[PDB]
């Protein structure tokens, strides 16, 4: 089997991407944030505290003929941005892009933090990191990908995120029309439960490539590119008037600037992030200070290849017995 679903930016900045997901019978379609940095599929629901719901579409298990309470199971998750959610668990039929899993754990939120409530466009998350990170207790649950894997034509999914445009998540196949040149594969460590890999270095603009190992994660659920302070300082030093602002919470730059590209290494291959991808616009409405898309990972404890980096590539998440990542230009 295969599945193919379009993923759409939630706003004009590509802050996140939403993908429609069918849950239950008859189908209830929710728009979920596919997150390769977490392992819970959780939804706004008929159980969510009413004051914490503001415009989201909810899953109502009582209206699904295939929903069953997973008795005694609870979940609670905290993300890198400080957001959180928790609740109880149902099993139900879940379909993505025509690919169906029966018996998927659908984590029903009873509580969500303010950042979720305030984002009316995101009806929940679909985690695509390794199932070792799933938070359901006392019986850990599998991701949608892990439950689909054995049925797929190939044990893979691909992320093809757009810049200010829709893109695609495919399950079970490589679309050889979706990228240019060849795919370069690189080793993955699953020790922390993430798609963790080592970049071979970077370049700023037209500068020379610096060969240096940068361990990080491929995380579709993180907006920005978070790299070591040395690398980030080297990038922003090429932008006149850029500075790190403790008041704003990272590097800002004059909105009048033209940003340089950023290149990262994948083995001997190179992925180029255009300068435009690194502009996250005014820090507040009407400001002439703009927020940077490359930020320091110091204090986060891991480097994160978030959407800024991933949307410059066609990315293969290879869930074979030995997992690997692949990157191609596009």
Residues with catalytic function? 35, 199
Phi/psi of residue 308, nearest 5 degrees: -50, -45
* Close Cβ partners of 64 (under 8 Å, ≥ 6 residues apart): 23, 24, 25, 26, 28, 92
Strands 196-204 and 184-187: unpaired
CA 34, 40, 42, 48 dihedral sign is: negative
In eight-state DSSP terms, residue 119 is: -
DSSP assignments along 276-287, one per residue: GGGEEEESSTT-
Phi/psi of residue 82, nearest 5 degrees: 90, -5
Distance of alpha carbon 104 from alpha carbon 122, whole angstroms: 20
């Amino acid at each position: 089997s295969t599945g193919s679903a379009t993923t759409t930016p939630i706003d004009s900045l590509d802050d996140a991407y939403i993908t429609p997901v069918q849950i239950g019978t008859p189908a209830q379609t929710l728009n979920l944030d596919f997150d390769t940095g977490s392992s819970d599929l959780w939804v706004f629901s008929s159980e969510t505290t009413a004051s914490e719901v503001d415009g989201q579409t909810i899953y109502t298990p009582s209206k699904s003929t295939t929903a069953k309470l997973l008795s005694g199971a609870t979940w609670s998750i905290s993300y890198g941005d400080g957001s959180s959610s928790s609740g109880d668990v149902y099993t139900d039929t879940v379909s993505v892009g025509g690919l169906t899993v029966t018996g998927q754990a659908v984590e029903s939120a009873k509580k969500v933090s303010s950042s979720f409530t305030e984002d009316s466009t995101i009806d929940g998350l679909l985690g695509l990191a390794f199932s070792t990170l799933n938070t359901v207790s006392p019986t850990q649950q599998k991701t949608f990908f892990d439950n689909a894997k054995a049925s797929l034509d190939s044990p893979v999914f691909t992320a093809d995120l757009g810049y200010h445009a829709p893109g695609t998540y495919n399950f079970g196949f490589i679309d050889t029309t979706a990228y240019t040149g060849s795919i370069t594969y690189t080793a993955v460590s699953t020790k922390q439960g993430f798609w963790e890999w080592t970049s071979t270095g970077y370049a700023v603009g037209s500068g020379t490539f610096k060969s240096t190992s940068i361990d990080g994660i491929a995380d579709t659920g993180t907006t920005l590119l978070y790299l070591p302070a040395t690398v980030v300082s080297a990038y922003w030093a090429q932008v006149s008037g850029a500075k790190s602002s403790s008041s704003v919470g990272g590097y800002v730059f004059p909105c009048s600037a033209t940003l340089p590209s950023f290149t990262f290494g994948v083995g001997s291959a190179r992925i180029v992030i255009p300068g435009d991808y690194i502009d996250f616009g005014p820090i507040s409405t009407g400001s002439s200070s703009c927020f940077g898309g490359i930020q320091s990972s110091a204090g986060i404890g891991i480097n994160i290849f978030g959407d800024v980096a991933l949307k410059a590539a066609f990315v293969v998440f290879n869930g074979a017995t030995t997992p690997t990542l692949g990157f191609a230009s596009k």
